[PDB]
Design a protein around this nucleic acid. Sequence first.
DNA 1: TTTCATTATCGGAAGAGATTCAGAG
RNA 2: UCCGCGGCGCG
DNA 3: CTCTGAATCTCTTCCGACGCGCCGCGAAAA
Lengths: 827, 49
Amino acid sequence: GKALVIVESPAKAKTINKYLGSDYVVKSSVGHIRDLPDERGALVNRMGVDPWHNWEAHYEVLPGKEKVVSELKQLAEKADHIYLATDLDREGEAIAWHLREVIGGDDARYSRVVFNEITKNAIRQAFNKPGELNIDRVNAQQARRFMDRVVGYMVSPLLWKKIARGLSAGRVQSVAVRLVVEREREIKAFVPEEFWEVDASTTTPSGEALALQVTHQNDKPFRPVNKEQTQAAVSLLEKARYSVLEREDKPTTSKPGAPFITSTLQQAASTRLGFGVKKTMMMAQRLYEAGYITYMRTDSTNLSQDAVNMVRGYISDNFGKKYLPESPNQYAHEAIRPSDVNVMAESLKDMEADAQKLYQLIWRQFVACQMTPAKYDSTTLTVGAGDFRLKARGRILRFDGWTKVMPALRILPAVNKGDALTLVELTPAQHFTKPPARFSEASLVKELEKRGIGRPSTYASIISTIQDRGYVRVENRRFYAEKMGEIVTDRLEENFRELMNYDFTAQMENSLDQVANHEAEWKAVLDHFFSDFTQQLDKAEKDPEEGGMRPNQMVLTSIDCPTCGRKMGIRTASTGVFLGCSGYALPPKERCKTTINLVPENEVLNVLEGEDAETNALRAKRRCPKCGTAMDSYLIDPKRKLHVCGNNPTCDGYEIEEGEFRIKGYDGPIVECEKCGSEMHLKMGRFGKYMACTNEECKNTRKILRNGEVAPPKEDPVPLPELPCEKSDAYFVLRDGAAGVFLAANTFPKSRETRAPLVEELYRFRDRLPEKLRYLADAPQQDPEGNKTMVRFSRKTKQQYVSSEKDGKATGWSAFYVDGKWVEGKK
Amino acid sequence: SAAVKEFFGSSQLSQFMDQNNPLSEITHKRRISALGPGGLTRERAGFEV
DNA sequence: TTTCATTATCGGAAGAGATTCAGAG
RNA sequence: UCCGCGGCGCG
DNA sequence: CTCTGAATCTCTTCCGACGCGCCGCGAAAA
Ligand SMILES: [Zn+2]
Ligand SMILES: [Zn+2]
Ligand SMILES: [Zn+2]
């Protein structure tokens, strides 16, 4: 019969089916298809794994792979022998394991094959010497997946109790934040070291110009710290006799870089094209799907022999011998490169301009890495002047080598040892040791991969999660730690030191490899892990005095609460960092729920200042009175501004300043009020999170919901008592918004039960319907087959229509409203 | 091309000219038959036909 | 009500089976 | 190079 | 009125001389 082959990526499938043709049926899982959704049953139900019952788990198809899994089940009967062809790593191995358990059948009906490359010399050997799925590898991945689950579902709740709701913690997530928090504290507590430099313009015995830098005085590195010292020196240099000591000419070399692995591609696109990680991956994705490059997700810089012959073949015809090395350049999925070297970026007229730019970056890196290096003649001049030593360095390109394909975007006059130099002028320059640079998206990814923290397919995702959770923020394409990030990072380091150690992942990988190599058993490894983890969790649950995680700590300040004038304190929530009034901790009688939003002053690093830009930012900050730590700045009134110490709330220094200020009043998500077009902003209160509009004349508020950015509009709601709910005891209400017209349950945040109305329902309650909606009740209630009809929103055309379903599938019949009439036909 | 060539070469309606005498050529060119595709067969031919 | 990371979007005659009609109880 | 088929003619 | 047995119909199965010259065709696989 016909053989069924299954791979992960659709694009790769289409390509395999080709170099294999008919008789076989290639398809893709398009991902995982299945995953997760003393002791506590609710907690275990939520986690989907039971640490107290030998790690029994409850996998379930992804809410977006129903179709995918269903097609494999019907197709499985036609196929004789099923060939699982996912990646050889543990993740791929697990996808194969899940497929086999979702499709059912008998073990012998399944086979495991690994595709080397697309070449027929590979797709052939695939079915030649195959094998079956490895249990040890599979269990290793299950162990990792379960450890990540336990941490996230068991630590986060602790945060909800001790700190705030909506908070999260995770093996990868929490150390990414720690990195930003440490860099933040590093920047705030630093102190620029003013230093001076002196250069001298001179003339050779011939008459040529020669620029020199002062390097030594009395044989000690020349580095004045103030203008006075700089002057004392210039005075001496002005009268000194200058003579050449040494001229060292030496051949030096440089070299192309490696082809871009997911991480390096992101960094190169970020530095040379200003692309953000997510964008770079979007363009790369387009290029891959159009067959121009290989898998956008890879951690290997390797190149096949064919790839290497293809590029050398190209270098040979387009540049000549001097550019082609005697033998392939050596260096320590495949690497990201063009699928065909002969295809230039300019010929991809079906791609966006940015995708062509990315392709060109990938192309040039791939050809250069195979091109010859850039030979230069470097010259170094040593000069003496009294007790000072001066230097001049030059370089002249002799052979571009690899820079021919990857261009980047010096002539020292002839002078011999013993020659005299004539002083023209001395130029002193003041400088300031600059603070460490703030992180960027690609830059943080680079640090993560360096420590083996994340995965190619998760880097981008990590960068976003820490922002959405409110731990850090991006400004001017650079990361800034938010107060909440610092708060959580300190708590986690205090109660879960092991988990917060950067090498936790590396240590975990070692244990996982042991499971994969029969040098340890997975349940035993999870049991050890869980024992340590629970020891920490239980300890964290206790009161601060017993070593229990410290709960948040209001730090007051001299500010008048607009509702009661009292002193005000500085507070952190999952939403951000905010100003609160101590009456929040007083019982209802004396309770005060007034709150103020703290707009921070965003650091605007000047690209033209280069390396100075971060140092001057540190210089810009005030310094705390009680400690050397820098201070971070916030706006409370157009008249008032607030300074807060970096070690807040461990340090309680605060400062308040007067002046004229452009206070925005808010920080967080953006939404546009359907009733007045103004900005709308996200706010927290006794019912959690609602969304509310800045125009004081309008109180229109929307709301957050389980799995979407914000609700559709709270406009013209009509209740019905006569429609009961079915999962809950509630009753159903009829609501309008951009999404459409929908039925929703009167205790909405609790019931969360919604269904589209039937036409017959509307007809039953037609008197209640507002004047416009009446037309929907006119609509034909039943189709020509006598099936029953439901009211749908055609997002592509922003209009209501009516449609009929049988066995829950669409019948393919629809009626629309067109000029006062209802018109009906096959979809 | 293949269909046309095989039709002109192998069809039972593509006879081999005898050309013994001019009258032979004429009487073979003017011949009319009820055989071939869509026609009868020697065995099925009834006495009436 | 609710948190984690990962992966990738001929005709004639004879014989056998099935169906129907006529005779018996 | 051993075969089969299609047409034609002789009795 | 209802069943059983024999007849009748419908479907399936065989078989339609014998020699002998001519002619021109048959198949491809990767
Ligand atoms: Zn107050
Ligand atoms: Zn301080
Ligand atoms: Zn509004």
